C-alpha cells in the first residue's frame with residue numbers, strides 16, 4: 001500500500017472527511033471502522049476527534065487498500081493519515097469506533113485495528129465503558 005497526498009476540505013463526522021485528492025473534492029469513508037452517528041452516544045465525540053485530528057495535521061495522506069476504492073455512494077474508501085498517524089486506528093484505539101465493514105480484499109490493516117480495539121475494550125474506553 002502507498003500513501004498519497006491530499007488536503008482537508010472539511011471534516012464531516014467521525015468516519016467521513018471531505019478531502020481534495022488529485023485536485024478533486026471527494027468524501028472519504030474510513031476503511032474498517034464504524035463510528036456512532038452524530039445523533040448517537042459518542043457520535044459527537046467521534047466527530048470532534050476526527051475533526052481535531054485532521055484539522056490540526058500539517059500533512060494528510062490517503063492510503064487505498066487492494067480492493068474497491070469507492071463505495072456504492074461514490075465515497076472514497078481509504079486509510080487516512082494525519083501527520084503520519086492513522087485516523088482509522090486512532091478512533092478504534094480510543095473506543096470511539098468499532099472495527100466493522102471488513103470485506104475481503106480491503107482488509108490489510110484489520111489485524112492492527114482489532115489489536116487496538118482489544119486494548120480500547122480492555123480499558124473500557126468510551127463505547128466500551
Ligand SMILES: Cc1cn([C@H]2C[C@H](OP(=O)(O)O)[C@@H](COP(=O)(O)O)O2)c(=O)[nH]c1=O
Pocket residue numbers: 029030031032033034071072077101103106
Ligand atoms: C466502510 C464501508 C462502508 N460501506 C457501505 C456499507 C453500508 O451500506 P448501507 O448504507 O447500505 O448500510 C454503508 C455504511 O456506511 P456509514 O457507516 O457511513 O453509514 O457504507 C462499503 O460498502 N464499503 C466499506 O468499506
Ligand SMILES: [Ca+2]
Pocket residue numbers: 015034035036037
Ligand atoms: Ca458511521
